[PDB]
Design a binder for this molecule. Sequence first.
Ligand SMILES: CCCCCCCCCCCC(=O)O
Ligand SMILES: CCCCCCCCCCCC(=O)O
Lengths: 237, 237, 60, 251, 34, 34, 280, 280
Amino acid sequence: GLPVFITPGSGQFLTTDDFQSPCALPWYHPTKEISIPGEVKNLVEICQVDSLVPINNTDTYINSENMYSVVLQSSINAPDKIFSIRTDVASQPLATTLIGEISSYFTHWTGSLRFSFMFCGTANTTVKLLLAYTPPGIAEPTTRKDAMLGTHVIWDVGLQSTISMVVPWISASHYRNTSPGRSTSGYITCWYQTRLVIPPQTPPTARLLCFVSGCKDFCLRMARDTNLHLQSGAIAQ
Amino acid sequence: GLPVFITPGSGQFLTTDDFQSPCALPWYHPTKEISIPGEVKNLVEICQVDSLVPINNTDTYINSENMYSVVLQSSINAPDKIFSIRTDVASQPLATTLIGEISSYFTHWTGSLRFSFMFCGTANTTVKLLLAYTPPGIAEPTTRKDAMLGTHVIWDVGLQSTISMVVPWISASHYRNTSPGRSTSGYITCWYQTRLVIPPQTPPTARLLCFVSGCKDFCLRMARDTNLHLQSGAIAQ
Amino acid sequence: GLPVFITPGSGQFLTTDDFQSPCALPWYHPTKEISIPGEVKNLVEICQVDSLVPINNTDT
Amino acid sequence: DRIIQITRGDSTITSQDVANAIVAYGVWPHYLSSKDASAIDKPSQPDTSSNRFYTLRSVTWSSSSKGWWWKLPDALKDMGIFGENMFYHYLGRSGYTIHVQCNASKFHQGTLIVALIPEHQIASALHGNVNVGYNYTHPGETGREVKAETRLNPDLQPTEEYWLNFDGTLLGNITIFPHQFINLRSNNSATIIAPYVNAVPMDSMRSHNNWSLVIIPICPLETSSAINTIPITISISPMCAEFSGARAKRQ
Amino acid sequence: LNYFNINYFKDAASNGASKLEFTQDPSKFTDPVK
Amino acid sequence: LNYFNINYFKDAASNGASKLEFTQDPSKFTDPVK
Amino acid sequence: ENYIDEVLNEVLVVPNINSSNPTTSNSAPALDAAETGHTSSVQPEDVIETRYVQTSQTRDEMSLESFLGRSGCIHESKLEVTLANYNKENFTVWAINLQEMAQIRRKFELFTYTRFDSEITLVPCISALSQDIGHITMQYMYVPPGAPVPNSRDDYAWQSGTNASVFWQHGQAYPRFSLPFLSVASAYYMFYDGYDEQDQNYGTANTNNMGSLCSRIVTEKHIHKVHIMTRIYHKAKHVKAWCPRPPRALEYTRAHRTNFKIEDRSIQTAIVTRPIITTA
Amino acid sequence: ENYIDEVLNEVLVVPNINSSNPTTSNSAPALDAAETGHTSSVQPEDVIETRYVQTSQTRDEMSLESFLGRSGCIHESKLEVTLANYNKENFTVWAINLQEMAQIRRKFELFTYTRFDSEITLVPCISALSQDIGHITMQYMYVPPGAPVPNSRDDYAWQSGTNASVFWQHGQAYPRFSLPFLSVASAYYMFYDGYDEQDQNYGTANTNNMGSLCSRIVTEKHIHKVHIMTRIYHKAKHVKAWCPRPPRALEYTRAHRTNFKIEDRSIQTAIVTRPIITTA
Ligand SMILES: CCCCCCCCCCCC(=O)O
Ligand SMILES: CCCCCCCCCCCC(=O)O
């Protein structure tokens, strides 16, 4: 006969609650747990793994393997641009990578980003390139002089065939929305530095690859529902 | 199977209750708190700040800056009255000041009040004035002799241009209603003491300003809803 | 998830009960109490005071 | 006393009759600590080449004036090294020091109100579904003056209700903001020192205005002399400025 | 005189009202100066 | 700051969510090698 | 010692009043200068003869937690069911903002920045337009920014894989839940002097974006005509604030804006005129 | 010390950022070789000049328990009662599987093996097709493999000698119960590369068989026409996982299968084309 007082919100079903409930199978003893390699404990281990990014997402190479590489020409003698993408973690074309796919389940993000490039050409072929990052608040650069005035790295190909640059975290606040709308986070571009030189009787073109992964300060919060998948009809049983 | 007894009043929704409820966002970690200047902890700090009072609230100066000042004439040689207002904290015209606006959210009040006056005239102009406060229970004075028989201060203008008088707390009970209805709390008046004297080739008029703030014994209680604001239609989204 | 058992007589309104209820005016501080002469604590003090009795209650 | 002397960079200001000085919210400006930092790159501190005094264009005070207002750091958008650094970077923060000077004779009378308002969001002039254009909130060093003649683009201009603080709040309650008075019979100068206040450690300098300066004549100017129009001058000095995120020039 | 006070949920937001502390009497508003 | 935590049922499945532990930072995924 | 004071609400004491005597000296505390932007510090025992009084009031009710810790309505949603095209209509979407009710908006707009936790309570009501109501069930789901927004009663988005949801049925008590401080910055913005990246949307319309709140009726097709009206109440906990501002004087017109002009209407405030200033 | 951190969710700290100075040496940490199948270990303080920053974020929300511990709908069953042949119809049978709702299926198929306990909640709804509903009672029974499956409303199998059952009636709250990890092996299979003993049924259609869930209406004959719709929600506790896999890119077609082809339909993914690659 203990007197009690009922508070508002009783009897409701909240999806994200945490309460204990009686079991339907008393005295049941589950199977023992053997050791299996490859146990994942946090989602941040997945985000620290490189994956290719579809740079060449035009209509011609829409469903093939040609969308992951970009071609270089040796007939060009000028400081020209090769490609340019946005650095927003959840925007195209890098929204479909591993880190992009995982980030679509949250709303806020922070930390730095790491980009890697690999050169796939003949061992007798040499080139020099320039990779630059542009902080927000200004239009996209159109000439090498404007691109140089910023965070940039100069790459020379040799015995090693991979380079890695980082995009520092530069923002007014501490977090950013994974779906920004009208705001941006900057651009990254690539330009010819000197030329692409080949010996006689050699293919006159070369390919390139790009990877992306998160640095040691990457983080996510405020989990939500992803927007990269949908169910139109009904799944057949 | 603990026996319990249900008491009356269970399941109700009381607006001013205090109960714990489950959270809808488990494991969420809010953003850190940086230091921002200007942190307010109590509402009494706002009430201890001076603000102007619209003494001249006639129809001519209804929407302008002329309602905050009163003019003095040098062509008057007589003990005349300049202005008079009521000392109720939540009545016109001092109901729209900071302390008046804050007091409209409560029902009871207590403590003393502080009034300040500033003289805005030529540096070669001199005057003497009389400020008096009349306790309740009697009609408003009409002559300087009646006004003098009370709490009053004599002001002489010089290098300093500001004077400050206080209105002591005199009441039968310990608190007063912010909306009194028929009762009153007294009056405060201003009279010419000697004259306003100017040199040759000088403007013949001068202006005055008034401020108000609470003393160290001001207090409020029994919070309610304000009556100085209303919503007629619907706010467009 | 503590299991409980409901006993008869729950939810009723008994006029002479004694239970605690939430307050509608949080953080309110009532007025102080001054000393007033003549404080009554029990009803037996009233019963120990003389009073006249209408012995002659005729119609006249 | 009435004497004051302030030296920021290579410039000095003196005055022989002032009324103390105001430190906004009782906090002195300083640099950014590592406990609150968000960006990871190294900031740039021009020091003495940018923390100096800059003077804006003067205005005329007559018997029919109504008021003026400015915005920061929009006013100093082209003042040498500070403007160049503001337009070459992406983030920045700084404090300020404001000095207002206006002198008259001993046969004049008048009073001014000088206030500094944070996050002063002004209201529109017309009714319906309208908003405020970008060009009219960034007038540069000239500032904005309340007038009566018809302006162009009525659907983008702000309001002229000076007595409503330009945003729907009664004048006379403005004393909560850091403020000072100028009485012609007492003093002729005002000084306010303000730190950096915001909800974020650092922010874009071309899309956000932290502070605003408002001048309102509460008592009309009146005199019997032949000098019936008095000028007003304003000087501003950045304190502890730093920038980050270098790129190409926005302009 | 006294009363019991126990939290039941694991989240801080889930708890009740904060305990009234101080009013920071020193007012920089009244005297905005060092 | 603190909170109560008592189990009422006799089964472990009946209890609430498990206490967050570690993330096993060493990632064999990043560097799949001894 | 600490339970007793707060149970009696005897914290936050007020200074007493000291007795005074007639004085005559060179120092004049009554005189001062108001051009310095400071408030005078004159006390009653400096200009009049006072009596020793032991004050007993306490300033607990003027604290921020007491002032802002009261529930108030912030929204009202009306849902009318139709028996034709049952699986297309019968859902509502609302964007979260505390700028549609005059009382709450004016109370909270007294400062520039704030930081607090929230508490939400729902009050559902059913209006009967037929002979009977039957069994009615309702669902409310919270959609953070970027998540898919349903556009039909039978959309797949209602499965609520990660989104939080709550259910209510006739005969049940009022639902209630709590929310933490959910913002990118360290505080909320009530006034913003800035634009977006395209130099558009002046005001707070860009910084504040907390998502949407959706609702639907879960019961299948039936033969009853009803209307559902739900009211949402909000209360703040663990409150902090900065930089107070003057109170609003006129009526609000639009959300996220400070416009006050009204077509064919003069400006009206709370000030009442007088015939003459020499008569109170 | 342990209550405080978890109440504030301050576990799982993140490393800080250290300051750096200009360098010029023979060692070049920026250069590496990606043919080794390893991830580069370059940090921001190796290629640029940084500032000392004390980070404050915590990675608690990306844990597996937080990620997978949310309720979501997995099934919807519709039961229409008929007043003719009352004792023959009016029962439903469903085979348990977590492969019929896109959100839950895609969330859980990010790994190869998992092991967890379950929690089930039911949301019953009644649709009125007549003047009144009356009194309605429902029963749900769990049938493990090998147990007799009822085929009528009045079958003897409803006596529930050993099978677990639950009852619901109008005006009652939502039922809820828990289940342990019930599998023959040490983990669940989301992908299986194998067949059965007859070299048939390729996939997971053979390893996963948890039984069936049955329901019926217990009320006897009446004169009311109603429809009953019940929704089942599931949440996982004490979760472990192994061997992560790439996320799904296309829509699902069938259960226990990975087929994606659709008649008279081109292949569509989430990638959006561009006019030219030199303009972002
Ligand atoms: C139903 C969810 C309602 C929660 C809203 C409270 C948080 C809003 C804080 C800032 C909103 C604004 O100022 O408009
Ligand atoms: C109503 C009972 C529902 C319980 C199902 C949860 C356990 C299923 C685990 C594996 C099922 C599968 O992967 O299809």
